[PDB]
Design a protein around this ligand. Structure first.
Ligand SMILES: NS(=O)(=O)c1cc2c(cc1Cl)N[C@H]([C@H]1C[C@H]3C=C[C@@H]1C3)NS2(=O)=O
Ligand SMILES: NS(=O)(=O)c1cc2c(cc1Cl)N[C@H]([C@H]1C[C@H]3C=C[C@@H]1C3)NS2(=O)=O
Ligand SMILES: NS(=O)(=O)c1cc2c(cc1Cl)N[C@H]([C@H]1C[C@H]3C=C[C@@H]1C3)NS2(=O)=O
Lengths: 175, 379, 41, 197, 50
């Protein structure tokens, strides 16, 4: 009865938030309010100096080999047209492989249609679940009253949903 | 400054020896009451109190109760245990517990304070990378005999191209070889990051300098553990934090209990010296009119902040049932409405002052980035 | 959150599909330079 | 000449952009435009007292050169700064856009600031000192239990307790209540309207 | 004795996690870090690319 009396009068809470806090010598609550300035040290921008000296040695290197190639010494429509064709279906391959593939994004998610989730452009699936190899393809997800309070992003979600832009990449590359 | 003595006190005799606020206050009452006043320092040299070890009054009130004193015009705070044994009039001066902190030092920017958002190790490495790029830009463009007359880049042009690139004004000449555009292009990414970091770090200095606030309340003293605070080890100020219910002062009490450097000092002038030593890291709790006079003395490096967290009052005391109490009480009310207590306050605390008051003024005085901040660039 | 999204190999191959198609395009322009050169030169 | 002048304009224009980034972020308040003395100097800032009261009798009965200037200035003042009631005088401040100030008791000034329409500030301290006091008749049989009780409430803190509770917790609005919030502001045209001019 | 037995076997843990969460399915801590918007992401300036 006395223990329940101390809590209703607040004493157990009183004896705790007094004791741990007022007899607490240091704390994040004690030191959090202060804020002073900081000049930038060299280690804040040290990588820009690294790329700069890396850009200097790269400049002197290609200046050396362009010189030596001229002193020791690719121009024909024939094989250039042939290499263009090899570059043509290669771009046609790398895009058409990409669209059907469900490995656009590695993420976390659930695929059970009501976890190393691999989601994709036209098919989003799951991996490292309870069972692997199942796909839950989603578009125009339900929002507040069929989303209609906003007008802007629904056109941006429908371009994601009815994904014309990777297809029009393929179709222009096919034409 | 209530009762003092001049330096030629042995040359003088009697009441003429003493000068002070209570000295003239005793002079103004005798003009309005008509009595012959003789000033007398208490031989004990203490404020009146009672210790129940022998149940004996000490100090000035002890001279009032027993019979040595006819009146006690003094810094004698009107309390309860004093009122029961001796009379007080209405208080002639108002005060309370306030905070004495070392005044923040005068903001003097260096002439090279514009170079301060970056370190000195950075500006040294910019000028070093300035030389290294321009020499590489000279070696690349004139590397080959095959041409040499077509390139306009000598050394004296190459130091100028890297100069206009860094200050982002743009130079009239531009590289034309492949490797000339490499050394030109990477330095353009170098000058994009450094100049944009310099501006945003300078915006971060001026934002925080506009946000740093002084300490202007006792709770604001309580919320921060940067600056420490202590009272008298023996005084009515120490009693006040114990006898108050309010949790702000109760945690200010338990802070004074359990801070590992002990914050209590023996007297007032020891606490004044502790303000001077800690370089603006120590606050001091004391009465307001003591706080007003001490910041008006040389070396002038202390100040009053905030306001009175409580209120007290100094009162003119007579023995209980004595005939003097009522004509003194009419005299105190007469001196206040004629502005005599206004005049005696403004004289003693300020003309024996001459330290500056509110010299900082507005916090937006440094809003406009004045000439003393960037005078070095003109130099 | 500590968002753990990372781009799989299908995303970067579309980026490699981008750059080669930019390279095939400018080589096609370079060939459109030359076919005008046999037409007029 | 071209080299050093470029290092000049790099520092200045970067300091111009940095100092705007400090202004538009930190909204430091207007510096409180007067104090006790500064109300006497700025004669374009009018200030008014009651036509018959304790504040009127104080400025004429003053030997201080600052207040003697204040009694001189309101004497030859146009329009008339003497007010009939406080509700008329408080209203003359809020309609005059800071050109008119009001001289009143500290107790009323802290209360008007906490009441709606909330648009006042108490700048500066007390010019004189006065005190409200519990009054008993001459020859009271209870004056001595009264004044001991008043000193008891202050030592126990009750007079300070009954004040900082009452004025603050029953205070509906305040600068302390609303000061903590801070949100963003897009630049309007009037901020940069002179550059178009 | 039964209340102390149910707590140490994690039954009160299990009956808590089931009733408050499986009859839940609203998202918890979806905001997460406040520094998620530290890096000025692509959705902030995608219109300039448009
Ligand atoms: N938060 S705490 O530790 O200070 C704290 C913790 C507890 C308190 C009171 C306090 Cl102040 N009382 C409760 C008690 C009230 C009733 C509910 C559980 C027991 C009976 N026990 S507790 O939940 O262990
Ligand atoms: N200027 S001051 O603070 O010394 C000061 C202090 C005080 C003054 C007047 C002045 Cl000028 N009178 C007030 C008033 C209250 C009652 C006692 C004296 C008058 C009537 N008391 S006070 O609070 O002791
Ligand atoms: N700050 S206040 O108005 O709440 C306030 C003001 C005053 C208080 C107490 C409080 Cl809480 N008591 C003092 C009293 C204590 C002794 C000194 C003056 C009288 C006798 N009078 S006061 O100076 O008028």
């Amino acid at each position: 009865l006395a223990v329940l009396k101390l809590s209703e009068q607040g004493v157990l809470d009183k004896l705790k938030n007094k004791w741990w806090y007022d007899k607490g010598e240091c704390g994040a609550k004690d030191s959090g309010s202060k804020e002073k300035t900081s000049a930038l040290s060299l280690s804040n921008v040290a990588g820009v100096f690294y790329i700069l000296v890396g850009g200097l040695g790269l400049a002197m290197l290609v200046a050396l080999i362009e010189f030596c190639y001229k002193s020791r010494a690719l121009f024909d429509r024939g094989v250039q047209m042939l290499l263009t064709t090899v570059g043509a279906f290669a771009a046609f391959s790398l895009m058409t492989i990409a669209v059907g593939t469900d490995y656009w994004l590695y993420s976390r998610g659930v695929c059970k249609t009501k976890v190393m989730t691999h989601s994709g452009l036209w098919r989003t699936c799951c991996l490292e679940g309870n069972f692997k190899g199942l796909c839950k393809q989603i578009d125009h997800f339900p929002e507040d009253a069929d989303y209609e309070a906003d007008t802007a992003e629904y056109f941006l979600r429908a371009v994601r949903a009815s994904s014309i832009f990777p297809i029009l990449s393929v179709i222009l590359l096919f034409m | 400054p209530y009762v003092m003595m001049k330096k030629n006190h042995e040359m003088l005799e009697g009441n003429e020896r003493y000068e002070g606020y209570c000295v003239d206050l005793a002079a103004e009452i005798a003009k309005h009451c008509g009595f012959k006043y003789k000033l007398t320092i208490v031989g004990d040299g203490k404020y009146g109190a009672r210790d129940a070890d022998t149940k004996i009054w000490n100090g000035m009130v002890g001279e009032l109760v027993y019979g040595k004193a006819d009146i006690a015009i003094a810094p004698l705070t009107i309390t309860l245990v004093r009122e029961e044994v001796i009379d007080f009039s209405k208080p002639f001066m108002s005060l309370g517990i306030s905070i004495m902190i070392k005044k923040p030092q005068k903001s003097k920017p260096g002439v090279f304070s514009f170079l301060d958002p970056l370190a000195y190790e950075i500006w040294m490495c910019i000028v070093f990378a300035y030389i290294g790029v321009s020499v590489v830009l000279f070696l690349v463009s004139r590397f080959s005999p095959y041409s040499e007359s077509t390139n306009e880049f000598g050394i004296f042009n190459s130091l100028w191209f890297s100069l206009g690139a860094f200050m982002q004004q743009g130079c009239d000449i531009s590289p034309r070889s492949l490797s000339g555009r490499i050394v030109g292009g990477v330095w353009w990414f170098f000058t994009l990051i450094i100049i944009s970091s310099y501006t945003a770090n300078l915006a971060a200095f001026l934002t925080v300098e506009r946000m740093v606030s002084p300490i202007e309340s006792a709770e604001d003293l309580s919320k921060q553990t940067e600056i420490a605070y202590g009272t008298l080890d023996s005084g009515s100020t120490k009693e006040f934090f114990r006898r108050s219910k309010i949790a702000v002062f109760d945690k200010m009490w338990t802070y004074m209990r359990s801070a590992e450097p002990s914050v209590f000092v023996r007297t007032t002038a020891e606490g004044v010296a502790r303000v001077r030593k800690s370089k603006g890291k120590y606050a001091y709790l004391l009465e307001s009119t003591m706080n007003e006079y001490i910041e008006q003395r040389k070396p002038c490096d202390t100040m009053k902040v905030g306001g009175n967290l409580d209120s007290k009052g100094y009162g003119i005391a007579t023995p209980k049932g004595s005939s003097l109490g009522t004509p003194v009480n009419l005299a105190v009310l007469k001196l206040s409405e004629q502005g005599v207590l206004d005049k005696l306050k403004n004289k003693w605390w300020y003309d024996k002052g001459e330290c500056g008051a509110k010299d900082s003024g507005s916090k937006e005085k440094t809003s406009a980035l004045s000439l003393s901040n960037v005078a070095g660039v003109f130099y | 959150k500590k968002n753990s999204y990372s781009y799989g190999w299908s995303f970067y191959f579309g980026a490699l599909s981008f750059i080669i198609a930019e390279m095939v395009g400018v080589l096609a322009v370079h060939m459109f330079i030359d076919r005008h050169k046999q037409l007029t030169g």
